[PDB]
CSV table of C-alpha atoms in Angstrom, one decimal:
chain,number,residue,atom,x,y,z
K,19,UNK,CA,-54.4,-126.3,27.7
K,20,UNK,CA,-51.3,-127.8,26.2
K,21,UNK,CA,-52.4,-130.6,23.8
K,22,UNK,CA,-51.0,-132.9,21.1
K,23,UNK,CA,-53.5,-134.4,18.7
K,24,UNK,CA,-52.3,-137.1,16.3
K,25,UNK,CA,-53.9,-138.4,13.1
K,26,UNK,CA,-56.0,-141.5,13.0
K,27,UNK,CA,-55.0,-145.1,12.6
K,28,UNK,CA,-53.9,-146.4,9.2
K,29,UNK,CA,-53.3,-149.6,7.3
K,30,UNK,CA,-50.3,-150.1,4.9
K,31,UNK,CA,-48.8,-153.0,2.9
K,32,UNK,CA,-45.3,-154.3,3.4
K,33,UNK,CA,-43.1,-151.9,1.5
K,34,UNK,CA,-45.4,-148.9,1.6
K,35,UNK,CA,-45.0,-145.8,3.7
K,36,UNK,CA,-47.0,-144.3,6.6
K,37,UNK,CA,-47.2,-140.6,7.6
K,38,UNK,CA,-48.6,-139.6,11.0
K,39,UNK,CA,-49.2,-136.0,12.0
K,40,UNK,CA,-49.0,-134.3,15.4
K,41,UNK,CA,-50.8,-130.9,15.9
K,42,UNK,CA,-49.7,-128.8,18.8
K,43,UNK,CA,-51.7,-126.2,20.7
K,44,UNK,CA,-51.4,-124.3,23.9
K,45,UNK,CA,-47.8,-123.2,23.6
K,46,UNK,CA,-45.3,-121.7,21.2
K,47,UNK,CA,-44.7,-124.4,18.7
K,48,UNK,CA,-41.3,-123.1,17.6
K,49,UNK,CA,-39.9,-123.0,21.1
K,50,UNK,CA,-40.2,-126.7,21.8
K,51,UNK,CA,-39.0,-129.9,20.2
K,52,UNK,CA,-41.2,-132.9,19.6
K,53,UNK,CA,-40.1,-136.5,20.1
K,54,UNK,CA,-41.5,-139.6,18.3
K,55,UNK,CA,-41.8,-142.9,20.2
K,56,UNK,CA,-43.0,-146.3,18.9
K,57,UNK,CA,-43.9,-149.3,20.9
K,58,UNK,CA,-45.1,-152.8,19.7
K,59,UNK,CA,-48.2,-154.0,21.5
K,60,UNK,CA,-46.2,-156.6,23.5
K,61,UNK,CA,-42.7,-155.1,23.5
K,62,UNK,CA,-40.8,-152.1,24.9
K,63,UNK,CA,-40.7,-148.4,24.2
K,64,UNK,CA,-38.5,-147.3,21.3
K,65,UNK,CA,-37.2,-143.8,20.6
K,66,UNK,CA,-37.4,-142.8,17.0
K,67,UNK,CA,-36.3,-139.1,16.8
K,68,UNK,CA,-37.1,-135.5,17.5
K,69,UNK,CA,-37.2,-132.2,15.6
K,70,UNK,CA,-36.9,-128.6,16.7
K,71,UNK,CA,-40.1,-126.5,16.2
K,72,UNK,CA,-38.0,-123.6,15.0
K,73,UNK,CA,-34.7,-124.9,13.6
K,74,UNK,CA,-36.2,-128.0,12.0
K,75,UNK,CA,-33.0,-130.0,12.6
K,76,UNK,CA,-33.6,-133.7,13.1
K,77,UNK,CA,-31.8,-136.5,14.9
K,78,UNK,CA,-33.1,-140.0,14.2
K,79,UNK,CA,-32.5,-143.3,15.8
K,80,UNK,CA,-29.6,-145.2,14.3
K,81,UNK,CA,-31.9,-148.2,13.8
K,82,UNK,CA,-34.3,-146.0,11.8
K,83,UNK,CA,-31.8,-143.7,10.0
K,84,UNK,CA,-32.6,-143.9,6.3
K,85,UNK,CA,-36.2,-144.9,6.6
K,86,UNK,CA,-37.7,-142.3,8.9
K,87,UNK,CA,-38.1,-138.6,8.1
K,88,UNK,CA,-39.5,-136.1,10.7
K,89,UNK,CA,-40.7,-132.8,9.5
K,90,UNK,CA,-42.7,-129.8,10.9
K,91,UNK,CA,-44.9,-127.0,9.6
K,92,UNK,CA,-44.6,-123.8,11.7
K,93,UNK,CA,-47.7,-122.2,10.2
K,94,UNK,CA,-49.8,-125.3,11.1
K,95,UNK,CA,-48.1,-126.0,14.4
K,96,UNK,CA,-47.9,-129.6,13.3
K,97,UNK,CA,-44.9,-132.0,13.2
K,98,UNK,CA,-44.9,-135.0,10.9
K,99,UNK,CA,-43.3,-138.5,10.9
K,100,UNK,CA,-42.9,-140.6,7.8
K,101,UNK,CA,-41.6,-144.2,7.8
K,102,UNK,CA,-41.0,-145.9,4.5
K,103,UNK,CA,-40.3,-149.6,3.6
K,104,UNK,CA,-42.7,-150.8,6.2
K,105,UNK,CA,-42.2,-154.4,7.5
K,106,UNK,CA,-44.2,-156.5,9.9
K,107,UNK,CA,-41.9,-155.4,12.7
K,108,UNK,CA,-43.3,-151.9,12.3
K,109,UNK,CA,-46.8,-152.7,13.6
K,110,UNK,CA,-46.9,-150.5,16.7
K,111,UNK,CA,-48.5,-147.5,18.4
K,112,UNK,CA,-46.7,-144.3,17.4
K,113,UNK,CA,-46.7,-141.4,19.8
K,114,UNK,CA,-45.5,-137.8,19.6
K,115,UNK,CA,-44.2,-136.2,22.8
K,116,UNK,CA,-43.1,-132.6,23.4
K,117,UNK,CA,-39.6,-132.0,24.8
K,118,UNK,CA,-39.3,-131.1,28.4
K,119,UNK,CA,-37.4,-127.8,27.8
K,120,UNK,CA,-37.7,-124.8,25.5
K,121,UNK,CA,-35.6,-121.8,24.5
K,122,UNK,CA,-31.9,-121.3,24.7
K,123,UNK,CA,-31.7,-121.7,28.5
K,124,UNK,CA,-33.8,-124.9,28.7
K,125,UNK,CA,-36.7,-123.6,30.9
K,126,UNK,CA,-40.1,-125.3,31.5
K,127,UNK,CA,-43.6,-124.0,31.5
K,128,UNK,CA,-46.7,-125.3,33.4
K,129,UNK,CA,-46.2,-128.8,32.0
K,130,UNK,CA,-43.5,-131.2,30.9
K,131,UNK,CA,-45.3,-134.6,30.3
K,132,UNK,CA,-47.3,-134.0,27.1
K,133,UNK,CA,-48.1,-137.1,25.0
K,134,UNK,CA,-50.3,-137.5,22.0
K,135,UNK,CA,-53.1,-140.0,22.2
K,136,UNK,CA,-51.1,-142.4,19.9
K,137,UNK,CA,-51.5,-143.7,16.4
K,138,UNK,CA,-51.6,-147.5,15.8
K,139,UNK,CA,-50.4,-148.3,12.3
K,140,UNK,CA,-50.8,-151.9,11.1
K,141,UNK,CA,-48.7,-153.2,8.1
K,142,UNK,CA,-50.5,-156.1,6.5
K,143,UNK,CA,-51.6,-157.4,3.1
K,144,UNK,CA,-55.0,-158.7,4.3
K,145,UNK,CA,-58.2,-157.0,3.3
K,146,UNK,CA,-59.5,-154.0,5.2
K,147,UNK,CA,-62.8,-154.9,6.7
K,148,UNK,CA,-65.3,-152.4,8.0
K,149,UNK,CA,-67.2,-152.9,11.3
K,150,UNK,CA,-70.8,-153.9,12.0
K,151,UNK,CA,-72.5,-152.3,15.0
K,152,UNK,CA,-75.3,-153.9,16.9
K,153,UNK,CA,-77.0,-152.6,20.1
K,154,UNK,CA,-76.9,-154.4,23.4
K,155,UNK,CA,-80.2,-153.9,25.1
K,156,UNK,CA,-80.0,-152.8,28.7
K,157,UNK,CA,-80.0,-155.6,31.3
K,158,UNK,CA,-80.3,-155.5,35.1
K,159,UNK,CA,-79.1,-159.0,36.0
K,160,UNK,CA,-75.6,-157.6,36.7
K,161,UNK,CA,-76.9,-155.6,39.7
K,162,UNK,CA,-75.7,-152.7,41.7
K,163,UNK,CA,-79.1,-151.3,42.9
K,164,UNK,CA,-80.9,-149.2,40.4
K,165,UNK,CA,-78.4,-149.7,37.6
K,166,UNK,CA,-78.7,-151.2,34.1
K,167,UNK,CA,-75.9,-152.3,31.7
K,168,UNK,CA,-76.3,-151.4,28.0
K,169,UNK,CA,-73.8,-151.3,25.2
K,170,UNK,CA,-72.9,-151.9,21.6
K,171,UNK,CA,-71.3,-154.8,19.7
K,172,UNK,CA,-68.7,-154.1,17.1
K,173,UNK,CA,-68.4,-157.2,14.9
K,174,UNK,CA,-66.0,-158.3,12.2
K,175,UNK,CA,-63.5,-155.5,11.6
K,176,UNK,CA,-59.9,-155.4,10.5
K,177,UNK,CA,-57.5,-154.2,11.5
K,178,UNK,CA,-57.4,-152.7,15.0
K,179,UNK,CA,-58.4,-150.4,16.5
K,180,UNK,CA,-62.0,-149.3,17.1
K,181,UNK,CA,-62.7,-146.4,19.4
K,182,UNK,CA,-66.1,-146.3,21.0
K,183,UNK,CA,-67.6,-143.1,22.4
K,184,UNK,CA,-70.9,-142.5,24.1
K,185,UNK,CA,-73.3,-139.6,23.5
K,186,UNK,CA,-70.4,-137.7,21.7
K,187,UNK,CA,-68.3,-137.9,24.8
K,188,UNK,CA,-70.9,-136.6,27.3
K,189,UNK,CA,-71.1,-140.1,29.0
K,190,UNK,CA,-67.9,-141.4,30.6
K,191,UNK,CA,-68.9,-142.6,34.0
K,192,UNK,CA,-69.3,-146.4,33.9
K,193,UNK,CA,-68.0,-146.9,30.3
K,194,UNK,CA,-66.2,-150.2,30.0
K,195,UNK,CA,-64.6,-150.9,26.5
K,196,UNK,CA,-63.4,-154.5,26.4
K,197,UNK,CA,-60.4,-155.5,24.2
K,198,UNK,CA,-61.4,-157.2,21.0
K,199,UNK,CA,-61.2,-161.0,20.2
K,200,UNK,CA,-59.2,-162.4,17.3
K,201,UNK,CA,-61.7,-164.7,15.5
K,202,UNK,CA,-60.5,-167.6,13.4
K,203,UNK,CA,-61.7,-165.7,10.4
K,204,UNK,CA,-58.9,-163.1,11.0
K,205,UNK,CA,-61.3,-160.3,12.0
K,206,UNK,CA,-61.8,-158.5,15.3
K,207,UNK,CA,-64.9,-158.0,17.5
K,208,UNK,CA,-65.2,-156.0,20.7
K,209,UNK,CA,-68.0,-154.7,23.0
K,210,UNK,CA,-68.3,-151.4,24.9
K,211,UNK,CA,-70.8,-151.4,27.8
K,212,UNK,CA,-71.9,-148.5,30.1
K,213,UNK,CA,-73.8,-148.8,33.4
K,214,UNK,CA,-76.5,-146.2,33.8
K,215,UNK,CA,-79.2,-145.6,36.4
K,216,UNK,CA,-82.4,-147.6,35.8
K,217,UNK,CA,-84.5,-144.4,36.2
K,218,UNK,CA,-82.9,-143.1,33.0
K,219,UNK,CA,-84.0,-146.1,31.0
K,220,UNK,CA,-86.6,-144.8,28.7
K,221,UNK,CA,-86.0,-141.1,29.4
K,222,UNK,CA,-82.2,-140.6,28.6
K,223,UNK,CA,-80.9,-141.0,25.1
K,224,UNK,CA,-78.0,-143.4,24.7
K,225,UNK,CA,-76.0,-143.5,21.5
K,226,UNK,CA,-72.6,-145.2,21.0
K,227,UNK,CA,-70.1,-143.6,18.6
K,228,UNK,CA,-68.1,-146.3,16.8
K,229,UNK,CA,-65.1,-145.0,14.8
K,230,UNK,CA,-62.9,-147.4,12.7
K,231,UNK,CA,-60.3,-145.1,11.1
K,232,UNK,CA,-58.5,-147.9,9.2
K,233,UNK,CA,-61.6,-148.2,7.0
K,234,UNK,CA,-63.0,-144.6,7.1
K,235,UNK,CA,-66.2,-145.8,8.8
K,236,UNK,CA,-68.2,-144.1,11.5
K,237,UNK,CA,-71.4,-145.5,13.1
K,238,UNK,CA,-73.8,-143.8,15.6
K,239,UNK,CA,-76.1,-146.5,17.0
K,240,UNK,CA,-79.0,-145.6,19.2
K,241,UNK,CA,-79.4,-148.0,22.2
K,242,UNK,CA,-83.0,-148.4,23.3
K,243,UNK,CA,-84.5,-150.9,25.8
K,244,UNK,CA,-86.3,-154.0,24.5
K,245,UNK,CA,-90.0,-153.8,23.5
K,246,UNK,CA,-91.5,-157.1,24.7
J,8,UNK,CA,-25.4,-147.7,19.8
J,9,UNK,CA,-25.9,-146.3,23.3
J,10,UNK,CA,-28.0,-148.4,25.7
J,11,UNK,CA,-29.6,-148.2,29.2
J,12,UNK,CA,-29.8,-151.5,31.1
J,13,UNK,CA,-32.6,-152.2,33.5
J,14,UNK,CA,-33.5,-155.3,35.5
J,15,UNK,CA,-36.0,-157.4,33.5
J,16,UNK,CA,-38.4,-157.8,36.5
J,17,UNK,CA,-38.5,-157.0,40.2
J,18,UNK,CA,-40.9,-158.4,42.9
J,19,UNK,CA,-42.0,-156.6,46.1
J,20,UNK,CA,-44.5,-157.0,49.0
J,21,UNK,CA,-47.1,-154.3,50.0
J,22,UNK,CA,-45.5,-151.7,52.2
J,23,UNK,CA,-42.0,-152.7,51.3
J,24,UNK,CA,-39.6,-150.4,49.4
J,25,UNK,CA,-38.8,-151.5,45.8
J,26,UNK,CA,-35.6,-150.4,44.0
J,27,UNK,CA,-35.5,-150.3,40.2
J,28,UNK,CA,-32.0,-149.5,38.8
J,29,UNK,CA,-30.8,-148.2,35.4
J,30,UNK,CA,-27.2,-148.3,34.3
J,31,UNK,CA,-25.7,-146.1,31.6
J,32,UNK,CA,-22.2,-144.9,30.7
J,33,UNK,CA,-23.3,-141.3,30.1
J,34,UNK,CA,-25.5,-141.1,33.3
J,35,UNK,CA,-22.5,-139.5,35.2
J,36,UNK,CA,-23.0,-136.4,33.1
J,37,UNK,CA,-26.5,-136.8,31.8
J,38,UNK,CA,-29.9,-136.6,33.6
J,39,UNK,CA,-32.2,-139.6,34.0
J,40,UNK,CA,-36.0,-139.8,33.4
J,41,UNK,CA,-38.4,-142.4,34.6
J,42,UNK,CA,-41.8,-143.5,33.1
J,43,UNK,CA,-44.6,-145.6,34.5
J,44,UNK,CA,-46.7,-147.5,31.9
J,45,UNK,CA,-49.6,-149.6,33.2
J,46,UNK,CA,-51.1,-152.4,31.1
J,47,UNK,CA,-53.1,-150.7,28.3
J,48,UNK,CA,-52.2,-147.1,29.0
J,49,UNK,CA,-49.7,-144.5,27.9
J,50,UNK,CA,-46.4,-143.9,29.9
J,51,UNK,CA,-46.4,-141.3,32.6
J,52,UNK,CA,-43.4,-139.2,33.6
J,53,UNK,CA,-42.9,-139.9,37.3
J,54,UNK,CA,-39.3,-138.7,37.8
J,55,UNK,CA,-37.3,-136.1,35.8
J,56,UNK,CA,-33.7,-135.0,36.1
J,57,UNK,CA,-32.5,-137.8,38.4
J,58,UNK,CA,-34.4,-136.7,41.5
J,59,UNK,CA,-37.0,-134.1,40.7
J,60,UNK,CA,-40.7,-135.2,40.9
J,61,UNK,CA,-43.4,-133.5,38.7
J,62,UNK,CA,-46.6,-132.2,40.1
J,63,UNK,CA,-49.3,-134.8,40.7
J,64,UNK,CA,-46.9,-137.7,41.3
J,65,UNK,CA,-47.2,-139.4,44.7
J,66,UNK,CA,-44.4,-138.6,47.2
J,67,UNK,CA,-43.5,-142.2,47.6
J,68,UNK,CA,-41.8,-142.1,44.2
J,69,UNK,CA,-38.2,-140.9,44.2
J,70,UNK,CA,-35.0,-141.4,42.3
J,71,UNK,CA,-31.2,-141.0,42.6
J,72,UNK,CA,-28.2,-141.3,40.4
J,73,UNK,CA,-24.5,-141.9,41.2
J,74,UNK,CA,-21.8,-143.0,38.8
J,75,UNK,CA,-23.1,-145.1,35.9
J,76,UNK,CA,-26.2,-146.3,37.7
J,77,UNK,CA,-29.5,-144.6,38.2
J,78,UNK,CA,-32.1,-145.9,40.7
J,79,UNK,CA,-35.9,-145.6,41.1
J,80,UNK,CA,-37.3,-146.2,44.6
J,81,UNK,CA,-40.9,-146.8,45.6
J,82,UNK,CA,-41.4,-146.5,49.3
J,83,UNK,CA,-44.4,-148.6,50.5
J,84,UNK,CA,-45.8,-149.7,47.1
J,85,UNK,CA,-49.4,-150.9,46.7
J,86,UNK,CA,-51.2,-152.9,44.0
J,87,UNK,CA,-51.6,-149.7,41.9
J,88,UNK,CA,-47.8,-149.4,41.4
J,89,UNK,CA,-47.7,-152.8,39.6
J,90,UNK,CA,-46.7,-151.8,36.1
J,91,UNK,CA,-43.8,-151.5,33.7
J,92,UNK,CA,-41.1,-148.9,34.4
J,93,UNK,CA,-38.7,-147.6,31.7
J,94,UNK,CA,-35.5,-145.6,31.8
J,95,UNK,CA,-34.8,-142.6,29.6
J,96,UNK,CA,-31.6,-140.6,28.9
J,97,UNK,CA,-29.4,-139.3,26.1
J,98,UNK,CA,-26.0,-140.3,24.7
J,99,UNK,CA,-22.7,-138.5,24.9
J,100,UNK,CA,-23.6,-135.7,22.4
J,101,UNK,CA,-27.1,-135.4,23.8
J,102,UNK,CA,-28.9,-135.4,20.4
J,103,UNK,CA,-30.5,-138.9,20.6
J,104,UNK,CA,-32.5,-140.4,23.4
J,105,UNK,CA,-32.6,-144.1,24.4
J,106,UNK,CA,-35.2,-146.0,26.5
J,107,UNK,CA,-34.3,-148.7,28.9
J,108,UNK,CA,-35.3,-152.3,28.5
J,109,UNK,CA,-38.2,-152.0,31.0
J,110,UNK,CA,-38.6,-153.3,34.5
J,111,UNK,CA,-41.8,-155.1,35.4
J,112,UNK,CA,-42.8,-154.5,39.1
J,113,UNK,CA,-45.0,-157.2,40.7
J,114,UNK,CA,-46.6,-156.8,44.1
J,115,UNK,CA,-47.0,-160.0,46.1
J,116,UNK,CA,-50.0,-161.3,48.1
J,117,UNK,CA,-52.9,-159.9,46.2
J,118,UNK,CA,-56.3,-161.2,47.4
J,119,UNK,CA,-58.6,-163.3,45.3
J,120,UNK,CA,-61.5,-161.6,43.5
J,121,UNK,CA,-64.7,-163.2,42.2
J,122,UNK,CA,-65.6,-162.3,38.6
J,123,UNK,CA,-68.8,-160.5,37.5
J,124,UNK,CA,-70.5,-162.0,34.5
J,125,UNK,CA,-72.8,-160.3,32.1
J,126,UNK,CA,-74.5,-162.1,29.1
J,127,UNK,CA,-76.4,-160.4,26.3
J,128,UNK,CA,-78.6,-162.3,24.0
J,129,UNK,CA,-78.5,-161.6,20.2
J,130,UNK,CA,-80.0,-158.3,19.2
J,131,UNK,CA,-83.1,-158.2,16.9
J,132,UNK,CA,-81.1,-156.2,14.4
J,133,UNK,CA,-78.4,-158.9,14.1
J,134,UNK,CA,-81.1,-161.6,13.6
J,135,UNK,CA,-82.4,-159.6,10.7
J,136,UNK,CA,-78.8,-159.6,9.3
J,137,UNK,CA,-78.9,-163.5,9.2
J,138,UNK,CA,-76.5,-163.7,12.2
J,139,UNK,CA,-76.6,-164.3,15.9
J,140,UNK,CA,-73.9,-163.4,18.5
J,141,UNK,CA,-73.9,-164.1,22.3
J,142,UNK,CA,-71.5,-161.9,24.3
J,143,UNK,CA,-70.4,-163.1,27.7
J,144,UNK,CA,-68.5,-160.4,29.7
J,145,UNK,CA,-66.3,-161.1,32.7
J,146,UNK,CA,-65.0,-158.4,34.9
J,147,UNK,CA,-63.2,-157.6,38.2
J,148,UNK,CA,-61.4,-160.9,39.0
J,149,UNK,CA,-57.9,-161.8,40.2
J,150,UNK,CA,-55.7,-163.7,39.4
J,151,UNK,CA,-55.8,-163.2,35.6
J,152,UNK,CA,-56.9,-166.7,34.8
J,153,UNK,CA,-60.5,-167.8,34.0
J,154,UNK,CA,-62.1,-170.8,32.3
J,155,UNK,CA,-65.0,-170.0,30.0
J,156,UNK,CA,-67.3,-172.7,28.6
J,157,UNK,CA,-70.4,-172.4,26.5
J,158,UNK,CA,-73.4,-174.8,26.5
J,159,UNK,CA,-76.3,-175.5,24.1
J,160,UNK,CA,-79.2,-176.5,26.2
J,161,UNK,CA,-77.2,-178.9,28.5
J,162,UNK,CA,-74.5,-180.1,26.1
J,163,UNK,CA,-71.2,-178.3,25.4
J,164,UNK,CA,-70.9,-176.1,22.4
J,165,UNK,CA,-68.9,-177.8,19.6
J,166,UNK,CA,-67.8,-174.7,17.6
J,167,UNK,CA,-68.1,-170.9,17.3
J,168,UNK,CA,-66.4,-169.7,20.5
J,169,UNK,CA,-63.7,-167.0,20.8
J,170,UNK,CA,-62.4,-165.9,24.2
J,171,UNK,CA,-59.9,-163.1,24.9
J,172,UNK,CA,-56.8,-163.5,27.0
J,173,UNK,CA,-57.4,-161.8,30.4
J,174,UNK,CA,-56.1,-158.3,30.5
J,175,UNK,CA,-55.5,-155.9,33.4
J,176,UNK,CA,-58.1,-153.1,33.8
J,177,UNK,CA,-57.8,-149.9,35.8
J,178,UNK,CA,-58.2,-151.2,39.3
J,179,UNK,CA,-55.5,-153.9,38.8
J,180,UNK,CA,-58.1,-156.6,38.2
J,181,UNK,CA,-58.7,-158.5,35.0
J,182,UNK,CA,-61.5,-158.7,32.4
J,183,UNK,CA,-62.2,-161.0,29.5
J,184,UNK,CA,-64.7,-161.4,26.7
J,185,UNK,CA,-66.3,-164.5,25.2
J,186,UNK,CA,-68.4,-164.5,22.1
J,187,UNK,CA,-70.7,-167.3,20.7
J,188,UNK,CA,-71.5,-166.8,17.0
J,189,UNK,CA,-74.6,-168.7,15.9
J,190,UNK,CA,-77.1,-168.8,13.1
J,191,UNK,CA,-80.7,-167.6,13.6
J,192,UNK,CA,-81.9,-171.3,13.1
J,193,UNK,CA,-79.6,-172.5,16.0
J,194,UNK,CA,-80.7,-169.7,18.3
J,195,UNK,CA,-84.4,-170.2,17.6
J,196,UNK,CA,-84.2,-174.0,18.0
J,197,UNK,CA,-82.5,-174.7,21.3
J,198,UNK,CA,-84.2,-173.9,24.5
J,199,UNK,CA,-81.3,-172.1,26.2
J,200,UNK,CA,-77.7,-171.1,25.9
J,201,UNK,CA,-75.2,-170.5,28.7
J,202,UNK,CA,-71.6,-169.4,29.3
J,203,UNK,CA,-70.0,-171.1,32.3
J,204,UNK,CA,-67.3,-169.0,34.1
J,205,UNK,CA,-65.0,-170.8,36.4
J,206,UNK,CA,-62.5,-168.9,38.6
J,207,UNK,CA,-60.5,-170.5,41.5
J,208,UNK,CA,-62.9,-173.4,41.8
J,209,UNK,CA,-66.0,-171.2,42.0
J,210,UNK,CA,-68.4,-171.3,39.1
J,211,UNK,CA,-70.9,-168.8,37.6
J,212,UNK,CA,-73.3,-169.7,34.9
J,213,UNK,CA,-75.6,-167.2,33.1
J,214,UNK,CA,-78.3,-168.5,30.8
J,215,UNK,CA,-80.3,-166.8,28.0
J,216,UNK,CA,-83.2,-168.1,26.0
J,217,UNK,CA,-84.6,-167.2,22.5
J,218,UNK,CA,-87.4,-164.5,22.4
R,13,UNK,CA,-21.9,-131.9,36.6
R,14,UNK,CA,-24.9,-132.9,34.4
R,15,UNK,CA,-26.5,-131.0,31.5
R,16,UNK,CA,-29.9,-130.9,29.9
R,17,UNK,CA,-30.8,-131.8,26.3
R,18,UNK,CA,-33.1,-129.1,24.9
R,19,UNK,CA,-33.2,-130.1,21.2
R,20,UNK,CA,-31.1,-131.2,18.2
R,21,UNK,CA,-28.0,-129.1,18.4
R,22,UNK,CA,-29.3,-127.3,21.5
R,23,UNK,CA,-27.5,-128.8,24.6
R,24,UNK,CA,-26.6,-126.9,27.8
R,25,UNK,CA,-23.5,-128.9,28.8
R,26,UNK,CA,-21.8,-129.0,32.2
């Protein structure tokens, strides 16, 4: 029931500012505090700051004091994080996490490990490139009896990431989303493949939902078997 | 300015008990919190308030704190426990939190695993877009090293190949991708294309042909 | 002994 939903991924230039939101639901927003944690894709976790849902008081990391500003909107149940003067060392996944305790006596409800899905911001001066989506016709050479492998190919996009859904989220069993390659052109390309029963080939509808937030692009590609 | 110091990496054998420490000057009068973060996933709170364990965490995880040193113990670890572990506590005033450096746990003696290979030919839509891409997927192999090679007919491909660095998946195995970008003329001319996957001496070769 | 850190300015000490 308790949930933290963050805003989508963004691209910024060196020197600009990024602002990520964090909408809370399932609990009294003013009783808890909300942390902010950043982590480079190949480095360690870093604590940024936290803000009270009711007081609004903030305590930032001494590394980020002067650049970061954490706010909150009680009427919207949403906390915000803004980081200015972005440099290449800021390319990271940004999370929001609810504090363990609430109230004046520091109690806990039916949860205490609540993390948002994460927002990957990428500071760069390169061009924002949209993705191209191509269907991967179902194949049966990769066996498991009565199972076919079909998917979608997301080609030439920048920057990361690209999230791929299947049938608007109704298909999760057997969904394998591979990490993207870094081509010599500077663009990325990944593939998302799902394994389905062979009896559903030609009767069940399969559509992949490609979402590239850095370019405001969404593609729903129908995946049908080949017609030879 | 406050810091929590963790060992950079610890190694353990299956069934053995692994100890991951965390030293901090305010730990005598401040609680400690532990997080498990596997490769490619979000951290998970496994230990809160020095010793307490949240619901859903296996009982083999436990923690203790004494003096300026907190400790995380994993009794009888398996391959699933192979991940990074971070420390988490506050400073003297208790208004700012600090994460530890991160301890990488490694379980020894993991069996070899043969990779599965899947190769898709270029789609008819992409050929209409004056492009051609061959995707060679590799999954479920250990260790995380693989040698991918492409072939035009029977000769090695001279250009147009990109291969990912092998990354850990859910079941603590590895997966990789390999793409061969071609033109419609090259794909329609040669008799066949193949991606050769070599892992621990063994070799798997999948071949596709135009139309 | 040890206290908990609720929020900024909110800290139940020893």
